[PDB]
Amino acid sequence: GSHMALSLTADQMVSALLDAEPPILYSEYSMMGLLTNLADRELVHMINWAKRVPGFVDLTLHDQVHLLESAWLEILMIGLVWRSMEHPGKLLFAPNLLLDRNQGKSVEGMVEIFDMLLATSSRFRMMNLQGEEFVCLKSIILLNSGVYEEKDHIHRVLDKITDTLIHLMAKAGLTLQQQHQRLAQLLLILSHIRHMSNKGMEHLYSMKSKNVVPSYDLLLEMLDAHRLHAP
């Protein structure tokens, strides 16, 4: 059978999100090349993950593309910041690619982006972000970032993810006041992730390459191509 997004319990939502998690990839090995190649390989896995986010396949192909076009960098960045949590002053791009601030100084303008990513990771570390909360946040990014009856459906799915976040906090023993405070603190970090993505996109455009950012067409092609993938 098929579970419709709005009928899932909080436990089922968490289970479906944890199950859809992409694998941890290795760097294939200069720095720019390694970071580009890794992002490209992670994008393929991001397509399969997005198709598994409850409510995402309920959207038209066009709406799915718009959401991925707006959110792809915020999604790579939140994944990066999550796995870099236990590595203060370093970014865990891959288990064979752990980079420090000074290493970012090799590429012009890259240190500014690394510093923002380091501060977000440090913030998640201080708040003791949990894996179940991280997966909720990543789905919120996907459904929220490109919002500007079908839009009401997206907002109802976003509401279900909020309910899921609150459920996790109430089960963790937080008071009603502490629940609203943590929810707000987590959602405010999403503003910082959007800012990092805009700065990241600007930096990517300040480069020689004419195909460094995924276009609407490439994202439509990848989403279309996914239909032809074997299960």
Ligand SMILES: Cc1c(OCCNCCCF)ncc(F)c1[C@@H]1c2[nH]c3ccccc3c2C[C@@H](C)N1C[C@@H](C)C(=O)O
């Ligand atoms: C994301 C990216 C990148 O993306 C190109 C993708 N092209 C798609 C095909 C054409 F449609 N190209 C070069 C880069 F170095 C980076 C790196 C990078 N790599 C990653 C891998 C895994 C997880 C996270 C990251 C990040 C985040 C960040 C540090 N990025 C720097 C970018 C934004 C910049 O400021 O130039």
